[PDB]
């Protein structure tokens, strides 16, 4: 029962750090240590996610996703987590009032991504 909340709602909090940092006018985040004198201010999404220790075991899946995106091109890494967070946010309504098999929802994305490209 809590596995779906940590994989959906718990994954949103990870994407909320990179949510407001998207765009040139986007906001910034703060990375603070115990000594607090080593901190820094930057809008980089890949640095914030890797620096903050994540006790959420489901949050480590999105870590390897950003590493694959950085190999292709060094731009748009932040937008990958933000777009993936919106799909997981709407997944809550896909359970309660929907009751639809998750693989059938994924197969629907392949038909939608084919027309989007």
């Amino acid at each position: 029962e809590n596995a779906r909340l940590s994989a959906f709602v718990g994954a949103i909090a990870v994407g909320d750090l990179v949510k407001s940092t998207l765009g040139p006018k986007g906001m910034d985040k703060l990375l603070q240590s115990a000594s607090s004198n080593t901190c820094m201010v930057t809008n980089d999404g890949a640095t914030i996610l890797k620096s903050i220790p994540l006790d959420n075991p489901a949050a480590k899946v999105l870590v390897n996703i950003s590493k694959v995106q950085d190999d292709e091109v060094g731009d748009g890494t932040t937008s990958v987590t933000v777009l993936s967070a919106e799909l997981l946010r709407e997944a809550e309504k896909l359970i309660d009032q929907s009751k639809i098999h998750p693989q059938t929802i994924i197969e629907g994305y392949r038909l939608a991504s084919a027309a989007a490209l």
Partner: protein, 58 residues
């Protein structure tokens, strides 16, 4: 965009709908496919998760 006018977009400076061809604001097409392909593969694994197995710390 629903009926005609498929080239319209949102202007951040004027806060209204303007022609993107006249303003000259464009984004790379390779970036669009890279994000959709990465989000489709990332969400494919997460939606199939019915339980969470914590990884062993190295």
């Amino acid at each position: 965009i629903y009926n005609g006018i498929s080239t319209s977009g949102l202007d951040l400076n004027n806060g209204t709908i303007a022609d993107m061809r006249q303003l000259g604001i464009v984004e790379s097409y390779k970036l669009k496919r890279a994000v959709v392909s990465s989000a489709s593969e990332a969400a494919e694994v997460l939606l199939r998760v019915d339980n969470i197995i914590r990884a062993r710390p190295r």
